[PDB]
Design an enzyme around this catalytic site. Structure first.
Site, PDB file in Angstrom:
ATOM      1  N   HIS A   2       0.811  -1.207   0.000  1.00 14.14           N
ATOM      2  CA  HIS A   2       0.000   0.000   0.000  1.00 14.14           C
ATOM      3  C   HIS A   2       0.849   1.264   0.000  1.00 14.14           C
ATOM      4  CE1 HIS A   2      -2.525  -3.211   1.715  1.00 14.14           C
ATOM      5  NE2 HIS A   2      -3.494  -2.621   1.039  1.00 14.14           N
TER       6      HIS A   2
HETATM    7  S1  FES Z   1       0.991  -2.014   3.658  1.00 14.70           S
HETATM    8 FE1  FES Z   1      -0.798  -3.369   3.569  1.00 14.70          FE
HETATM    9  S2  FES Z   1       0.662  -5.068   3.519  1.00 14.70           S
HETATM   10 FE2  FES Z   1       2.457  -3.709   3.572  1.00 14.70          FE
END
Ligand code: FES
Ligand SMILES: CCCCCCCCCCCCCCCCCC(=O)OC[C@H](COP(=O)([O-])OCC(O)COP(=O)([O-])OC[C@@H](COC(=O)CCCCCCCCCCCCCCCCC)OC(=O)CCCCCCCCCCCCCCCCC)OC(=O)CCCCCCCCCCCCCCCCC
Ligand SMILES: CCCCCCCCCCCCCCCCCC(=O)OC[C@H](COP(=O)([O-])OCC(O)COP(=O)([O-])OC[C@@H](COC(=O)CCCCCCCCCCCCCCCCC)OC(=O)CCCCCCCCCCCCCCCCC)OC(=O)CCCCCCCCCCCCCCCCC
Ligand SMILES: CCCCCCCCCCCCCCCC(=O)OC[C@H](COP(=O)([O-])OCC[N+](C)(C)C)OC(=O)CCCCCCCCCCCCCCC
Ligand SMILES: CCCCCCCCCCCCCCCC(=O)OC[C@H](COP(=O)(O)OCCN)OC(=O)CCCCCCCCCCCCCCC
Ligand SMILES: CCCCCCCCCCCCCCCC(=O)OC[C@H](COP(=O)(O)OCCN)OC(=O)CCCCCCCCCCCCCCC
Ligand SMILES: CCCCCCCCCCCCCCCC(=O)OC[C@H](COP(=O)(O)OCCN)OC(=O)CCCCCCCCCCCCCCC
Ligand SMILES: CCCCCCCCCCCCCCCC(=O)OC[C@H](COP(=O)(O)OCCN)OC(=O)CCCCCCCCCCCCCCC
Ligand code: HEC
Ligand code: HEC
Ligand code: HEM
Ligand code: HEM
EC number: 7.1.1.8
Lengths: 123, 247, 385, 93, 247, 93
Positions: free
Chosen positions: A89
């Protein structure tokens, strides 16, 4: 329980192990980025947490590179302060695995790792 | 068929684990591992027995760790893809002397040495056949046999001609508890070790069998009583018959 | 008497399929049961002929499935028939259940029939989850891990029941060999439960779309409903042959053609399409223990239906509000299924929560209030005072 | 065998309905009938009667749920675009 | 997620096998095998396609025998037990370029090239995705992105950054039937070939589907007639109620 | 369901035996009895009575077949000995 040892891996670039079906950080650790893991924000970002109770070896680092959110994977040594971009993300960890980004709730898990001296082997 | 091609029957030796309450003599399993490693491991393999099964049965943890680390196993390759070796750990299996069947048949004049990790369950005779085979080499093959070259005479082997020479001679292995290592001593110990390798569940199987036979014979006799109790009314039932008056 | 009555086995066959008195009023929705029987026989036979070539280790599962596809004669027919027939089995089973709760078939003479149906539904869901886990693709593996790590929410014995399910520490070779043995096994339990379904049906006979008694004119099942079932059998085989031969990987996910890899998450883990509404129900609750309790409650809420239906006439054939809220429920189920295939983004969590609340408020709030209102409207519309 | 409980459906002769009197039923052999009789009339007129009676119950909830899904899908595609990032960063954060 | 994280959707090109009566262009599969062998075989594998499956689809028997014999597989070890090698036969599989995954990740900058033997079924979009990905590489990424080094922009790949650089260039392969081998023609040919490798049953499946759909449609309509003929006597039943006299 | 065919066993009340008249049966509660009564007498005398009645039927064919098996086994052991090869060749071919 698999037990991976010390002297064949030098100071300053990554290992990411697969133990018990799961991949995790290890690094031999950097002088004032161990002591920049003393430079830490305590709680103006997400967690009040623990470099001593997180990693007990001052110079080496396994913990569970399952990404924080629900279980994806990061890069090695390109990112925040010289570290670990998880592009799952768009978030970031290094030399004690702390969040400065994104939707991540908590830091990463550390298993019961013990020692051949203080030579890092996981169980 | 002829008793020659049947093979002579092995007699009934008084093994210390024959009997329904008996246990493997673990000191003889430890000595039999020494006899296997110093004599039998040149030709036969043991690839069904992991190293970790020896811990707490015949050796300690450190001893099996050292005996595993004195061997080399294949590791997963490095970051460049080249193959890599690894010192052995407890999870690994006991390695054999030959890399395939062809190296075995080349090194033993055509014949292939069987894997010994199930060989006392795979031969009719059990441990007695293995003991009689290891100790049953006459000095001369008896008067009139056409023995092929490279073959030896052993009457317990079916046919007579075995491709394994006599490998157990006196004092060829020194025991670290000072037992006099005769031919029969070494054959006894290696046959007990091979029987453990075939049936590593033997002691717990007999203990659970004791519990189970006691509980089931208790229940059987108690059910005989409960059946006779519930059936007493039908067993002790009387019938009288007065013929009815005709209408 | 006739030999079909004076036998032991032919007496059962006669009593169930030949001389069974059916109400003459039953429409085409009363063929879904014989359709589910045909589907079950299809699944069992094609699964046996694929298990003759399937190897169940974790390093051989996926490649054994492709050995069935590429090397076995007509094996793509078998695999595509098994997968699309499983999905067709579930569409027909959803129609069977939707007919049952439209026409009031759950009601007071047939509550044990409804409950044996709910047990059959739970067992088919389990069978298809295990069979999807046997192919060991990427959605297969990660579906297995999220659904088995659901059970770690139980606060006392959760870690040990998930380590007992896994056979180890994550989904690997013991888990896959387990799931194959169970995916064989649970269909024969389903066949036993279908025999019990028929036994519980046979004591009172089937309902009819009027909801009035059907005891007055009745028709033997042979030569009338045998052919009326044959119509839907040939239609179902036609539509299944379309999806098998012209469009086979349509209902499936493409990520089951990636082999299972424990180190790469496929960025949207979704199960097969029929488990999407229960997946959205599970996903809507912001807790894991309450999530699995609410998913199991979402499928165990079909048992409160014969006690919350508060009306004196059976079915929605002659009620307007029951018809309207029934189709609100059905399109709520379809929206729930479409919410379960989307990511956890901003309108979808609220839409899934409201649709889950509507799903539960149908059984527990809407059916009693609408039943009571329709009762008193039926009274005061025709009595004078 | 043993006798079981009282059900609500008997068999051919004792079905368990009320007594029937004064109802006569007539039926002709199908071998003397025309199947597919009236199919072109029923296909257009009876189907229109059935549609006209039974379509508001089906297409008002379908319309409500389809408009809901369309509007939510539009809001998601708006919020994950460049023009609607500020409302995304205030609607999640 | 955003449109960049989803990836741009591939448009619907007009493949010669789109449609329920169509068939793979087999010359397109032969040309696509040539483009695979000459460009794609350096990095990607074809682990599921045996050599014998090409005979009678894209090449002749000897044409496949020579292409298999130009490779070398592991033979059974010889009579001394040493490892041996072998020229390939029709039974063997198409060999990848790398011996393991670590060699692959080392040779291609950390990323592992997927095996292409199921890649048009493993990807959402299928043939359109493979074609549009291969021909979708712009000459410069859009103004604003921060591409990591060693990675290339391709908007049809989800996220945009792909570790495969642009491999298809004009007239890098010469076809043996004189086709002008440009980027679009070569991408068309490899995508037809990869679709054959994923679905080698495609022609027979569509032909059998024609047979079943015709037979089952006829059976469905004929069964509608037989149902109406059986139920004629019940659909044309008439009830008359004269109310019985009070008694 | 419909009634099935005529069987030779009904149920409790209508088994299908003959009518019974004049037979009176008596029985005592097992809670007022001694179970295991007469086990040491029946274990030695009744067991001998049942054995004496039914042992020639079992042990004459057992003796016949065991003697046949032992004789065939002895002949097979003789034929594959050194003393009996010169019958073995003229026996098999
Ligand atoms: S930010 Fe959701 S898994 Fe690394
Ligand atoms: C037309 C649609 C319509 O309006 O129908 C309603 C109409 C009357 O409607 P109704 O009585 O008001 O409806 C009452 C019930 O709904 C139904 O009452 P019923 O049970 O009496 O009717 C049976 C019902 C059975 O149908 C069903 O119940 C299935 C449910 C509906 C499915 C609808 C979608 C079907 C999609 C099919 C393709 C995929 O029949 C149909 O509904 C026919 C639908 C077929 C649609 C396509 C017709 C194409 C004709 C060419 O029924 C018919 O028209 C029947 C026509 C069928 C004639 C079949 C004659 C076949 C002759 C022999 C064929 C031989 C083939 C080649 C042989 C080669 C030999 C080698
Ligand atoms: C095509 C769309 C149909 C619209 C026109 C049909 C006439 C109409 O407006 O009916 C409204 C009608 C309301 O009529 P109703 O008499 O009030 O309903 C009484 C029963 O619901 C229905 O009682 P039933 O015995 O009539 O049920 C038969 C019904 C329903 O039959 C079934 O439910 C069978 C369901 C499928 C069986 C095979 C399953 C295959 C498994 C995979 C399924 C994948 C999906 O199938 C039909 O409606 C056949 C007549 C079709 C006439 C076509 C006229 C087209 C314009 C010319 O609702 C339906 O007929 C729904 C069926 C539509 C399905 C076709 C798609
Ligand atoms: C669109 C609106 C068109 C209306 C068509 C229509 O309503 O057809 C009416 C008749 C139906 O005829 P039928 O269904 O066989 O009824 C038989 C009873 N009669 C008429 C003999 C008394 O008409 C027919 O016979 C139609 C038969 C010809 C249709 C061929 C397929 C087009
Ligand atoms: C072929 C020749 C056979 C013998 C000749 C003959 O067919 O004999 C004719 C007999 C005689 O019957 P009756 O009533 O005249 O007896 C008069 C005695 N006095 O009828 C029968 O067998 C009964 C046939 C019943 C058919 C039932 C079909 C069941 C279909 C499903 C099968 C099970 C599926 C389970 C899944
Ligand atoms: C899971 C539980 C489910 C319960 C319900 C199951 C009911 C079965 C439903 C499936 C339909 C089976 C159709 C059997 C038809 C029959 O065998 O018909 C027997 C009829 C009896 O004709 P008649 O006596 O009317 O002859 C009147 C004058 N003698 O001979 C026929 O006309 C033969 C017509 C050809 C039939 C071909 C059917 C092929 C079926 C393929 C699909 C099979 C699945
Ligand atoms: C609480 C919230 C409200 C819930 C109740 C809403 C129910 C809506 C039902 C509407 C309905 O039932 O309309 C169904 C009716 C059925 O027509 P008919 O064949 O009975 O005509 C009988 C006439 N003598 O269609 C119509 O009138 C025709 C509609 C035409 C529209 C243009
Ligand atoms: C057609 C060709 C036929 C050829 C068949 C040849 C063989 C004929 C069958 C012979 C069966 C074996 C002998 C049965 C007699 C028997 O079992 O006697 C059982 C008898 C008695 O029994 P009891 O005390 O219950 O009876 C009591 C008399 N009413 O015990 C003994 O005497 C034991 C003493 C001898 C030891
Ligand atoms: C060197 C070569 C050795 C050594 C040191 C041992 N064995 Fe034995 N063995 C060997 C061959 C080539 C064969 C095959 C002979 C044949 O024709 O079958 C064998 C055979 C056995 C058997 C099987 C006997 C049978 O088939 O009935 C057993 C059991 C066996 N060998 C055991 C054994 C043990 C316990 C040893 C202990 C030191 C041992 N062998 C030595 C080759 C060789
Ligand atoms: C050399 C190195 C090459 C060559 C000559 C080709 N490919 Fe491609 N490929 C390669 C890598 C290292 C990767 C991984 C990139 C990543 O980030 O995953 C790929 C990727 C693909 C994919 C998958 C893309 C996706 O997952 O959506 C396909 C499909 C693919 N490659 C096909 C392909 C074809 C048809 C080629 C024809 C000449 C081809 N590649 C060349 C490495 C390399
Ligand atoms: C209750 C009926 C059944 C259902 C609902 C069912 C469901 C499924 C499903 C959904 C799959 C995954 C299909 C895919 O995506 O590839 C599957 C796979 C499989 N099923 Fe079943 N199944 C049933 C009965 C059986 C039975 C009885 C067997 C064994 C004899 C069986 C054997 C298999 C096998 C071997 C696979 C392997 C993967 C494949 O070949 O597709 N099935 N099943
Ligand atoms: C393997 C799956 C199933 C099979 C083979 C099956 C079989 C049947 C059959 C043959 C009938 C009679 C025909 C009919 O009424 O449609 C029937 C009726 C019924 N089934 Fe099922 N069934 C299955 C699953 C279910 C499920 C999941 C439910 C609901 C929870 C259910 C509930 C009912 C009810 C309520 C009836 C009576 C309907 C009525 O006649 O009014 N069944 N079933």
């Amino acid at each position: 329980k698999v037990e991976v040892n010390l002297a064949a891996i030098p100071l300053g670039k990554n290992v990411v192990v697969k133990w018990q079906g799961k991949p995790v950080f290890i690094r031999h650790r950097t002088p004032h980025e161990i002591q920049e893991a003393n430079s830490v924000d305590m709680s103006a970002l997400k967690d009040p947490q623990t470099d001593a109770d997180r990693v007990k070896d001052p110079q080496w680092l396994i913990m569970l590179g399952i990404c924080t959110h629900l279980g994806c994977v990061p890069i090695g040594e390109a990112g925040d302060f010289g570290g670990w971009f998880c592009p799952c993300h768009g978030s970031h960890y290094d030399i004690s695995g702390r969040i400065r980004k994104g939707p991540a709730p908590l830091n990463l898990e550390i298993p019961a790792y013990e020692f051949d001296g203080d030579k890092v082997i996981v169980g | 068929m002829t008793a020659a091609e049947h093979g002579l029957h092995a007699p009934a030796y008084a093994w210390s684990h024959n009997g329904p309450f008996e246990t493997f003599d673990h000191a003889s399993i430890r000595r039999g591992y020494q006899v296997y490693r110093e004599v039998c491991a040149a030709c036969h393999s043991l690839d069904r027995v992991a190293w970790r099964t020896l811990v707490g049965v015949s050796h300690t943890n450190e001893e099996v760790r050292n005996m595993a680390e004195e061997f080399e196993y294949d590791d997963e390759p490095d970051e460049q893809g080249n193959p890599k070796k690894r010192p052995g750990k407890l999870s690994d299996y006991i390695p054999g002397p030959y890399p395939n069947e062809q190296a075995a048949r080349a090194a033993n004049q055509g014949a292939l040495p069987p894997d010994l990790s199930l060989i006392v369950k795979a031969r009719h005779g059990g441990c007695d056949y293995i003991f009689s085979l290891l100790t049953g080499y006459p000095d001369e093959p008896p008067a009139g046999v056409a023995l092929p070259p490279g073959s030896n005479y052993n009457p317990y082997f079916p046919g007579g001609s075995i491709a394994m020479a006599r490998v157990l001679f006196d004092d060829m292995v020194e025991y670290e508890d000072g037992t006099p290592a005769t031919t029969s001593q070494m054959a006894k110990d290696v046959t007990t070790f091979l029987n453990w390798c075939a049936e590593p569940e033997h002691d717990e199987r007999k203990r659970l069998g004791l519990k189970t036979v006691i509980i089931l014979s208790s229940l059987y006799l108690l059910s005989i009583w409960v059946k006779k109790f519930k059936w007493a009314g039908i067993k002790t039932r009387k019938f009288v018959f007065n013929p009815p008056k005709p209408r | 008497m006739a030999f079909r009555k004076s036998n032991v086995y032919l007496s059962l066959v006669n009593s169930y399929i030949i001389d069974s008195p059916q109400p003459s009023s039953i429409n085409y929705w009363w063929n879904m049961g014989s359709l589910l029987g045909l589907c079950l026989v299809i699944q069992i036979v094609t699964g046996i002929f694929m298990a003759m070539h399937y190897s169940s280790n974790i390093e051989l599962a996926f490649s054994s499935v492709e050995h069935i596809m590429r090397d076995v004669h007509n094996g793509y027919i078998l695999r595509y028939l098994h997968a699309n027939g499983a999905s067709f089995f579930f569409m027909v089973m959803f129609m069977h259940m939707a007919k049952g709760l439209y026409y009031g078939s759950y009601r007071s003479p047939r509550v044990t029939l409804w409950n044996v149906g709910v047990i059959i539904f739970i067992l088919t869901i389990a069978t298809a989850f295990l069979g999807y886990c046997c192919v060991y693709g990427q959605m297969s593996h990660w579906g297995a891990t999220v659904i088995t790590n659901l059970f770690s929410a139980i606060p006392f014995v959760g870690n040990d029941i998930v380590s007992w399910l896994w056979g180890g520490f994550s989904v690997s070779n013991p888990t896959i060999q387990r799931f194959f043995a169970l995916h064989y096994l649970v269909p024969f339990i389903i066949a036993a439960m279908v025999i019990m379904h028929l036994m519980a049906l046979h004591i009172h006979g089937s309902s009819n779309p009027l909801g009035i008694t059907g005891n007055l004119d009745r028709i033997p099942m042979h030569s009338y409903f045998i052919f009326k079932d044959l119509v839907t059998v040939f239609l179902f085989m036609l539509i299944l042959a379309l999806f098998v031969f012209y469009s086979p990987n349509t209902l499936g996910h493409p990520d089951n053609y990636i082999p299972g890899n424990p180190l790469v998450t496929p960025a949207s883990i979704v199960p097969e399409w029929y488990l999407l509404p229960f997946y959205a129900i599970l996903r809507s609750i912001p807790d894991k223990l309450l999530g699995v309790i609410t998913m199991f409650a979402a499928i165990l809420v079909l048992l409160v239906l014969p006690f919350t239906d508060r009306s004196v006439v059976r079915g929605n054939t002659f009620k307007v509000l029951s018809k309207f809220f029934f189709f609100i429920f059905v399109f709520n189920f379809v929206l729930l299924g479409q919410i379960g295939a989307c990511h956890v983004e901003v309108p979808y969590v609220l839409m899934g929560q409201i649709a889950t609340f509507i799903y539960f408020a149908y059984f527990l709030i809407i059916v009693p209030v609408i039943s009571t209102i329709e009762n008193v409207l039926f009274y005061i519309g025709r009595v004078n005072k | 065998g043993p006798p079981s409980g009282k059900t609500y459906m008997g068999w051919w002769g004792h079905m368990g309905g009320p007594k029937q009197k004064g109802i006569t039923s007539y039926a002709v052999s199908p071998y003397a009938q025309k199947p597919l009789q009236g199919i072109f009339h029923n296909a257009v007129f009876n189907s229109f009667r059935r549609f006209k009676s039974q379509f508001l119950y089906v297409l008002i909830p379908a319309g409500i749920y389809w408009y809901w899904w369309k509007n939510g899908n539009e809001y998601n595609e708006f919020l994950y675009s460049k023009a609607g990032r500020e409302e995304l960063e205030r609607v999640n954060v």
